[PDB]
Amino acid sequence: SFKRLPFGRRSTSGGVNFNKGLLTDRERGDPFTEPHAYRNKKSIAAISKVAKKQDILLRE
Amino acid sequence: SRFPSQTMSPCSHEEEMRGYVVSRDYPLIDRLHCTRSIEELVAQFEDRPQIESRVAALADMASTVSFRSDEELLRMFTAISAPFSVDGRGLNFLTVKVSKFGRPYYVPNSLLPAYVNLVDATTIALVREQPWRLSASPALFIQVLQFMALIKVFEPNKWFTFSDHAPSNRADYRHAIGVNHSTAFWGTGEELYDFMVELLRVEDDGRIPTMLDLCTR
Amino acid sequence: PSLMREKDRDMYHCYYPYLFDHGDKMSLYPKIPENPREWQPEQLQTTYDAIREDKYDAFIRLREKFPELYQDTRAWDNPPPFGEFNMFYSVRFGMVGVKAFTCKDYDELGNQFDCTAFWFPDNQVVKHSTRNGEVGTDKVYVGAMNVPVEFHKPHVAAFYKAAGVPVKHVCAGFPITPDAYAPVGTKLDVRHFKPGQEVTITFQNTDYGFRGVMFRHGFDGGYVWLGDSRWQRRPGAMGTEGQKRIYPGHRMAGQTGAAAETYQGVPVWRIDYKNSLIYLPTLLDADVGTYVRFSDTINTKGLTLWNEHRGLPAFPTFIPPEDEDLSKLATDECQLKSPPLYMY
Amino acid sequence: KARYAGIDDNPTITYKPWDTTEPLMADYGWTRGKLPKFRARSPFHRQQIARRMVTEMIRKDYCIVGGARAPALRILADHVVELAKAGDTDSRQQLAYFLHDPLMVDKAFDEYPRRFKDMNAKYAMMTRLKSRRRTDAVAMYFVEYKNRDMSDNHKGEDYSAGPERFFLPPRIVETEKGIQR
Amino acid sequence: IATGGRVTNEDRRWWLVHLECAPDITPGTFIAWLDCCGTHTCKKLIERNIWTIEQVAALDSDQVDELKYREGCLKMDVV
Amino acid sequence: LRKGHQIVFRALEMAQQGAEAKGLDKEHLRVAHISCYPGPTDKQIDIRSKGYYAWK
Amino acid sequence: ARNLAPGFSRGALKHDWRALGVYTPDHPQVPYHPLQTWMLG
Amino acid sequence: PKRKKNPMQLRRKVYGLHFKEKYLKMEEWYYCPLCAEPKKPGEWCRREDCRQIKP
Amino acid sequence: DSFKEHYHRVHLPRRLALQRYARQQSLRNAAKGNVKAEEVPYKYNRWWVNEEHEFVHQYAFVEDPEVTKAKRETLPPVTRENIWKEPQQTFFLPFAPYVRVVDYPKDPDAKFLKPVNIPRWKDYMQRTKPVIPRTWY
Amino acid sequence: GYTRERTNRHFFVARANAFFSRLPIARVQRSLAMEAVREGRMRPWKYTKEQILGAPVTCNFEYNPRPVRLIGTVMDAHTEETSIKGGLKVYARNEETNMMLWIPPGNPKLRHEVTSTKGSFQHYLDERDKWDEAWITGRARMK
Amino acid sequence: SPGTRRRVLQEYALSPLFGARVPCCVVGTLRTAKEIIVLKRDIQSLLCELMELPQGSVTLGPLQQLREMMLYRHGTPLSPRLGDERQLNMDAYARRPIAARTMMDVFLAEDMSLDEIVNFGRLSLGKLQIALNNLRKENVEPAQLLVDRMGISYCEIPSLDESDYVFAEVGGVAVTDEEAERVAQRWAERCE
Amino acid sequence: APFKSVLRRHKHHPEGLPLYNDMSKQWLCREGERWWLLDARG
RNA sequence: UUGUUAAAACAAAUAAAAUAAAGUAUGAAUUAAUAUCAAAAUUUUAAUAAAAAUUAAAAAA
RNA sequence: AUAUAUUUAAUUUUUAUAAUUAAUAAUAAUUAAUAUAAGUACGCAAGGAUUGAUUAUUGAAAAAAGAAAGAAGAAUAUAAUUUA
């Protein structure tokens, strides 16, 4: 790792930067409420999942 | 009348951790002082010659150099002055050869700072807090003088030079950019040597030689 | 400050009775030459001057008779002894903390502060060091994050053995004045700091590696130019200098981050002396786990930090009382919040 | 910055163990929060490589891979063992979607529960071989499942050397030659 | 909750004060409402025929030890 | 991991076999003089994509 | 802790630190036993 | 402006640390206690013994 | 090596040797059996009035080696309860607050009826430093 | 002339992510949340995203002379349990004025109360469509 | 209503701590929890015989396995307990190696008071210390049985859990002693 | 042909710059060395 | 961001995120007066002067 | 609208530990307006003071000693969350 040494980052802790005060993905829970998630006309995944979720919630 | 908070698992007599003691005010100052005998320290130094054992014994005797006696001090200095020679370099312990820049430079092990701390502790013990031990015992005077001559203290460049054809300047050189900060300009034995020469000049002002009358030809 | 030439230090400018050295005993008259021949032809050797005698006598009488009226004039003699905390001379060593996490708090006025919590695991005064015994050249090394023996390198475990202090992970040196010492092995409780206190912190920001000149300096990196060449302001003659080389300091692409960053004068928000936590309303750039170092701010706005109007520090270092037990004491009981402050 | 895989469909009464991942889709990256991305031609190519690799791993119980493919393969094998321990119909549908061979899907779902009933995590095992690939001078790693001889269709097999032919069954230790597949 | 190791009186008071936020929670609810109750944690209780908060509270020390160490439920002690 | 290292490994193997055949012991063998001097040479031209000649 | 050697500094057999004055309040240590010749070489 | 470089400028590269650590450097090796082969610590063999226990 | 760099590189060991020679005179006293710390003459002339008729105070502080050794060895006393409990003030209160309102004058707009003990606006603005006699805040 | 950007100083490069285990950081978060609850800056909440999403809420921002009241519909809740993080996404419409606020819990000068933990996804969808139509109309009138 | 909401919050805040119990002496062994599973039942009988209480009074809580750590740390409650303590050996420069990795708490009847609990804890601690010393000196009594056949080698007396906190002010309103007594009487009636 | 190595000492180099009073070069004599005192008053 | 149309769509273009384009072996060609080439500033001699002189001191990859 | 030399930006990989020495005055010419300073001197009236503190940018400035062919992660941010 001497040729890459001047460019690549170097760390002793192994690259562990985890803040237990910030908001995590499991705490956010579901991103479909975000505007991008339900108006992302460019992702079949986003469109299909948000449609399925809204239909399931309305049915329930 | 108190009871402990947990059970103490049994242990053999040889595997105990005796020999040290915490300071008086433990809940505020947890300094650890050694109470081992100088004979034990010398036996460890002479039986286990590993560098870690050497530095541990040196630190123990440097912490115990305060309340010991003249005979124990002479014994300690005679046991310490064994691996040193006058022909070779005095206090050189160069182990690592770093050639990061153009020409290489040598980094020693912990034995050099161990010896430096020992000399400093001896200076503090025989100069500042007990200024009469040298004038009282001329044997300890000559012993510490011969030890300080055997380890080349007044030329710390020979501590860091590896080949006599290219002497080192690790101690006498220093630049404000940040090079040679901890290693340059070490006041190792200057104060002790000044105290000794002042003791030898005390005769001219005292009109009668105390040290020179106590010592032998 | 007010300029005061040394030549203006004559007795006609002194606010108190000017006292000449005069050997062992202070006198009110210049030292008369013992050799009479040394007397200069116009030098008027004064042995008794009724003016100065009366002035000094009345001054001493008033000082000894009305202590309440002349209390401020008592600093002319019996100065504060050495060892007590001084407002302009006593600086104390800081501590070594670990950036724990981030949260947000709110003051009573309604302002939101995005704070970061640092953790001070085991602060212990490890070493003292002075170079050749000069003035103001002494400092105290404090160690932190006690570790086992199998962790550190051999050459640093050797130093910790030589010191006798329990082997710490990190060790930072603070330059202090000799009257602020603390014995080797002294535990430093976090209550050493106060909540309404300004602190200067030093850490290492995160590492981004080699980054472009745009990302390094933002908009500043795109345009970099400096010309110290002479140029004609008026068309009278012809003469200039060619900028041959590139001047040092040219903003280019290179290493970004991973440097020693120091914030100066951030106020403390809250202190938890059960888990050894300190909260600062400033969001830092460093990662989680960077050993920050906290030190006391000297002065701000021409005003010293430690004074009677703001408060007295825990000089030299805070020592808890005996009957206090942090184990029995709860977490909610160990909370010290700073007085309110508005910044908008 | 946001992962659409968090948008949950057909939610169960109980929250999933991961609750944020696929968990087969790994979102390869270089920060420690993600998996090491082995060099490919596109993220789709990377996913296809991972799919074929985990399929072959499930098929032949071992895989020798070079470069950063070994940690990715190990974590994906761990996720597959987690799916097998779950044993739900949706989990099986997802594994059949992600894998190339439904026969290997069935083999995994049949053999892995009995195999890893008595284990919590770190089911696979990666061993860095001292021998590097000749064409690239890249390190190689042997990734295999740990519980081979306690309960599995493979048992008492020798992996120190390959068979006489690559279409013959693998070597079998003489101690357990009586077992049948 | 991320207690870890041993449940403390702080976590006890947390659960007590959060019990107010749910008005519909009855002692007969499904075991999934409890905290740290994952799929693998609750399926073992279903195997042992534990469908109720009352039952999972009446669970014995040896039984929860078996559920944690032999079955593989991580936070069964917290549950 | 160097082609030169592989070639000199082959050379060391052959030299050890020859020394054994001559009658020298195996444990006390040491390289005394290893050198290389330029030898033969070949020149190869080749066409590339869209018709460019390259020399090697 | 396969890589971790008890008492040695960073798992190095030639840097024995056990049964010395290394004050360590919270962490334990192992008593001393003289290493063999085949262990060091 | 490019010109032929004297032999001294061709030997300046070996003074830097980049050339020394790349080409000319020895290995720390020992004998695999199960294979009796030279082995670097950290990289193991394919054999069943070397995978279960690390030699 | 610049001119100043070479000058300092060749003079710094000489400066240290000169300081050692200076401390040798101090060690002369402890050598004769009478260990005596260095004495410094306390200067009573440190409060001056400048040319522009304003007060200047010089600060001279001394270091005691015995007190240094005492602070090195003996632990400091227990910190004061009020000192560690009462937080430090954030804003520095002015030397003279302008209240602008006093209940003593019957007509508050009467400028001649306000008591003299209340500080003025001129003091409120100019008094940013302590008075001539008192030096510390 | 020359300067250095990186520092290999041991005290700066050493990390404590391995020793972060002895600090009960989650317990500190819960203690801060409980202190806020006992002071009254926030009130504990236990709802899920789909349950709270679509429930009317009233928020009073205290302000002399008149505290400003605002009745809106909860569009998104960032946290399911009480914490110092919190976060709520409300949408309120005045007379010909729509607005989307992100209310953080724990502000003493801000008292927000959801009128019912139960929510109507139909009304949520209605409010979402109204907000999206207003946003699109604003963008179209701008550009 | 906000008033009644703060009232029910104050009620649940001043409510007595349910499901909380103080342990007498936390026992610890070096074997694994999966091995202690099969012997945990006889531990109750042997502890009853050690405490000289009627059979069936000792209750063992959930078995815990202190998480093994390559980098030891003392402050964690999941840390493996050490055979030595600072109060035991102040003048020792380090601690003795790990003694316990599988732990279990021991409870008496709920009617017994804290003085009886701490007395029984001290008795158990002393008896186990004597038993371990006799084991070391040698290589019938319940202590010797627990030490030999069950592999128990650690006992701890846990400090009182002070993480609990009194509610001096709920919802921004101070708690009066009359209201606290009313809530306490209500909870006592509900328990009755 | 004489040759001075390019790898010379430097002020940033840790080895540092030497003292000619301490050096032992060929062209540096130390036997015939006398000490003179020079007062610069005026 | 701009422009066109209508009461959102299209086309342009860059600056943030994301994707790729090796640390492996194979290996040319432009160029080549040259001292182990003169870091810089000042002054000057027949046109950039890297030609000369005076200060000054410019490490290696 | 050609790969060059000088000059610059970096790097030479945990170094327990900054700088009494190159940045030879100053990061603004040690500021500095501002509500409150003042419905007030000065002005017949109209109108109109000098002025420095809390509101701001004011800490001005370089972290050079230890054994080196994996990913500085055994990688899904836990220094092994039980593990056959």
Ligand SMILES: [Mg+2]
């Ligand atoms: Mg290094």
Ligand SMILES: [Zn+2]
């Ligand atoms: Zn092998």
